[PDB]
Design a protein around this nucleic acid. Structure first.
Lengths: 61, 136, 386
RNA sequence: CAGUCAAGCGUUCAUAGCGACAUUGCUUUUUGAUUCUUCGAUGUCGGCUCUUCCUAUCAUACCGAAGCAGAAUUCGGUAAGCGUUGGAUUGUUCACCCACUAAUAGGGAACGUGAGCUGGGUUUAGACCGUCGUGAGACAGGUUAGUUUUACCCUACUGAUGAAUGUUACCGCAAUAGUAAUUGAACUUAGUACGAGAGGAACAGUUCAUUCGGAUAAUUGGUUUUUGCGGCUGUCUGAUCAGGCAUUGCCGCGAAGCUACCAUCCGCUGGAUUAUGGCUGAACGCCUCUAAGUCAGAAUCCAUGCUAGAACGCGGUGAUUUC
RNA sequence: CUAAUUAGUGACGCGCAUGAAUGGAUUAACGAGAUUCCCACUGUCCCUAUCUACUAUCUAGCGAAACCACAGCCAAGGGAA
RNA sequence: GUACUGAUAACCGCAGCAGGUCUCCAAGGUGAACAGCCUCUAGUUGAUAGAAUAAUGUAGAUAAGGGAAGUCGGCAAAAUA
């Protein structure tokens, strides 16, 4: 029973929750919901989405 | 599945009906794979025999070297890109439907596999597992 | 001419029946078989479906690929406050079937029970069982007389229980009354157990246990008048069809000139009585116990009620049964949990389960935090806080 | 389609499987024959859809024979419980090939099924070609374009109420009616039995899967008038904030609800039998599964179980009105 | 050409019964003409699901027609089959 | 002769019928535009209503993975712009 973290937003991914996504170069993306999954497939930047962990790390929140 | 696939396959979501064209993954010379039937598939009125990761499918090569073309050969699906559920609760999906061509016994005609391979394919066909690089 | 193409039929003709049920409380047509070498025990129990959540546990199934490996499994939680015995009932064997000859009640019935025998409870003088308690007035003579009348006759003995619905967060003050057949011991010892439990409660941990396989009897969630494509699962007619496509095209042959009963025809969907057998009990939880959702592996103090409560139900504060898989009926519904009638030994049973984690994130959305302490530990201090 | 007889085939050997010359039947899914019904009209072919029935059984269950060593196969018995597919070409029924499959059996129901659809075909009117005709025109020749109407009535069916048998409420019984599960793969048995070798099983056990069914919505996915939040265009409110209209303006996310083998869960075990193999045992001093008796046995039947509860089937229990 | 093509195209031609202003053969451009294939695209399909408006539904008012021997539960029998 | 309508109510369609019926004038923005979309003057706010939100319709949509396997035929929709 491992709690995984969101690749996009840094949220916690509890067991049996959200989707996983294996890219063509075998890089594993685990998403907590369809919201952060859809923002990834829109090629959005996590550092420019205000509620992500990477925003609050870069903006020193 | 069936012959040459030692072990069982848990039911994952069928994502590739008859008439699907999936990418090729091995260095056999093919560029795509046109699925025409699934081994071990069942019968229902108007139900398309649909394929998933790990199954041996009957498939022709539409695009590739002409020494592979216009004939029907067994192929093994190594990537699905339809989201299926494993029993540990996670849903996952690749970037593309992709397969490797083989004999009916289960030996790969090619020698390498580019891209990742699902583990339900690797554990079921050991010659896929030996030729694969990253598994999932 | 013939069909030209065989297909299995759409629907099941043994549930061909599709009408609305007689009540929200579905009847138990068969209690488990009686083995009189055992102690006295109830054969079923009444509960309320709260909703579903997710469990992580280890598998013990040697020969499988997920053996000794964590799997996640959907479960149902039913809130079971301790049922309380108000009556006993005797049934004698006839050549025409079981016949109730006598029904004895207790001296004091609560307003939950009395409220069941009333359609307008607030307007009433509240006269129910007022003259009946006079039988307990003179020294208990006639009560023991009808008890001995049960003891002489009455090949099978059932017990009238009722739910404590005031401990259950619904707005429904009127409780449900039911007959649960006792099993073990003699007919004498059956009605002795029944007399000694008048006005006293029976908890669910005396009726079930860990790793038991139980049947769930309930009423399917109703949907109203429904067309044939969803009520029966018929292939949709193509795009070019005049007068509708969510239909059945041929209704029958010309000979005979009647519509047959077995054709798929529109009507009511849902609100059917259904019994589903072989559901494994994953947890018997206690209301007098915080950390209900905790685990030997987890060890966080948390109850099974998720963040913001069970949606459309409320907040579980009583004993509960957490049972693997899907149960008929929606949330809030009265559900009868029966012991299995046959000894299921097919190795999916007899597996001693032991959970690893219980999901208590909010089912009101993409719930991501199991506890409010964890939510605060992630997010830090906010504008509302301190 | 099924028999009867047996000259021969089957190295030997009529009847394991076949079987000529003859001969006896059955069926009405063929085509004829007839013209009884309908010309003050029973809507044509084929396909789709959907239900049920037949058995002359393709598969599955249990068996019996073999020219049955194993494997594979062939012949037959009970059996219609259960399934019997996806496609290329053709309007096709029919056909033919491709592949999967456990198997891709044959049929009926006004050649089932057009107030169910479709209208590719045939079979009005337009038109072209070929052949025929002096011609108008013909073709059981080819081609192309060609309006598919009505249920609100009775019955049937599916659901839904409901008067009356003191009133009203609660808990029940169960007559009857229906019914459901299905089929395969892998591992092990086991490179074992068997076999000169080549090859090569089965019962039991385990793990899964196919087809179906009943639910369900924790998760994943879909749906968005939560017009919930944000963004954007054009315009109007003098600006700003906040909005209106663009028939839901559009875009991203989106709870809840509904829902998907696109998601998850679940789908019972007892008896009586058929075919068959037997026991004792006469008729027929022997022998025999049969005559009396009887043992075991099929996916069969009946019950357990599941669904509904006779609105004219029944029980128990509570309260039973005063101006 | 396709895994498979009674379709399509290219050839072949003792052509039932092609053929020269009954005009023959060919033709760029044009066509709501007929047909075949490919890319794209999609709920046409696998396999269905969900949402919106107006109906249908219930109510107040208004209020027809088709059709109608009598009417309306079957199984079989016979009977203008 | 001179009023008035000139039509979703003054005309013709059995009628106060979504049909038909000749013409003049012709604002601002966006925009190539007498297109669509919004506004000013002028003119309407007429069309049986109320309540619920079953099935099946009619009109409008959206769909995971596959992409014509559906079908006589890519019909209808999508895609493109």
């Amino acid at each position: 029973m491992k709690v995984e973290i969101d690749s996009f937003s840094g949220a916690k991914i509890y067991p049996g929750r959200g989707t996983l996504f294996v890219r063509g170069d075998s890089k594993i993306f685990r998403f907590q919901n369809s919201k952060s999954a859809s923002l990834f497939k829109q090629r959005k930047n996590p550092r420019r989405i205000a509620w992500t962990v990477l925003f609050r790390k870069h903006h020193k929140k | 599945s069936g012959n040459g696939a030692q072990g069982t396959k848990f039911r994952i979501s069928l994502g590739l009906p008859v008439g699907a064209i999936m990418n090729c993954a091995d260095n056999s010379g093919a560029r795509n794979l046109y699925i025409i039937a699934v081994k071990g598939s069942g019968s229902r009125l108007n139900r398309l025999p649909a394929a998933s990761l790990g199954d041996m499918v009957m498939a022709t090569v539409k695009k590739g070297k002409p020494e592979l073309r216009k004939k029907v050969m067994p192929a093994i699906v190594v990537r699905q890109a339809k989201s299926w559920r494993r029993r540990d609760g996670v849903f996952l999906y690749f970037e593309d439907n992709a397969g490797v061509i083989a004999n009916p016994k289960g030996e790969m005609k090619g020698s390498a596999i580019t891209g990742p391979v699902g583990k339900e394919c690797a554990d079921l066909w050991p010659r896929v597992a030996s030729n694969s690089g990253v598994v999932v | 001419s013939h069909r030209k193409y065989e297909a299995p039929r759409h629907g099941h003709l043994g549930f061909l029946p599709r009408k609305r049920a007689a009540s929200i409380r579905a009847r138990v047509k068969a209690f488990p078989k009686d083995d009189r070498s055992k102690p006295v025990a109830l054969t079923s129990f009444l509960g309320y479906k709260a909703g579903m959540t997710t469990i992580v546990r280890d598998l013990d199934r040697p020969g499988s690929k997920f053996h000794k490996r964590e799997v996640v499994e959907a479960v149902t939680v039913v809130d079971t406050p301790p049922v309380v015995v108000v009556g006993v009932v005797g049934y004698v064997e006839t050549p025409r079937g079981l016949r109730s000859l006598t029904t004895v009640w207790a001296e004091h019935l609560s307003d939950e029970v009395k409220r069941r025998f009333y359609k307008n409870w607030y307007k009433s003088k509240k006269k129910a069982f007022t003259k009946y308690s006079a039988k307990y007035a003179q020294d208990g003579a006639g009560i023991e007389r009808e008890l001995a009348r049960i003891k002489k006759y009455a090949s099978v003995v059932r017990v009238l229980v009722h739910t404590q619905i005031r401990k259950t967060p619904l707005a429904q003050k009127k409780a449900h009354l039911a007959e649960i057949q006792l099993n073990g011991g003699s007919i004498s010892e059956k009605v002795d157990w029944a007399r000694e439990h008048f006005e006293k409660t029976v908890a669910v941990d005396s009726v079930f246990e860990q790793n038991e396989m139980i049947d769930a009897i309930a009423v399917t969630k109703g949907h109203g008048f429904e067309g044939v494509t969803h009520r029966w699962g018929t292939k949709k007619l193509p795009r070019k069809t005049h007068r509708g496509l969510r239909k059945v095209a041929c209704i029958g042959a010309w000979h005979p000139a009647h519509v047959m009963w077995s054709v798929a025809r529109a009507g009511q969907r849902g609100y059917h009585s259904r019994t589903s057998i072989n559901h494994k009990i994953y947890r018997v939880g206690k209301g007098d116990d915080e950390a209900n959702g905790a685990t030997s592996f987890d060890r966080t103090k948390k109850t099974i009620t998720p963040m913001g409560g069970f949606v459309h139900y409320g907040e579980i504060k009583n004993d509960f049964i957490m049972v693997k898989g899907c149960i008929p009926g929606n949330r809030k519904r009265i559900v009868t949990l029966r012991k299995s009638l046959y000894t299921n030994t097919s190795r999916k049973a007899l597996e001693e389960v032991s959970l690893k984690w219980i999901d208590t994130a909010s089912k009101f959305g993409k719930g991501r935090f199991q506890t409010p302490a964890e939510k605060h530990a992630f997010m830090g201090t906010l504008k509302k806080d301190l």
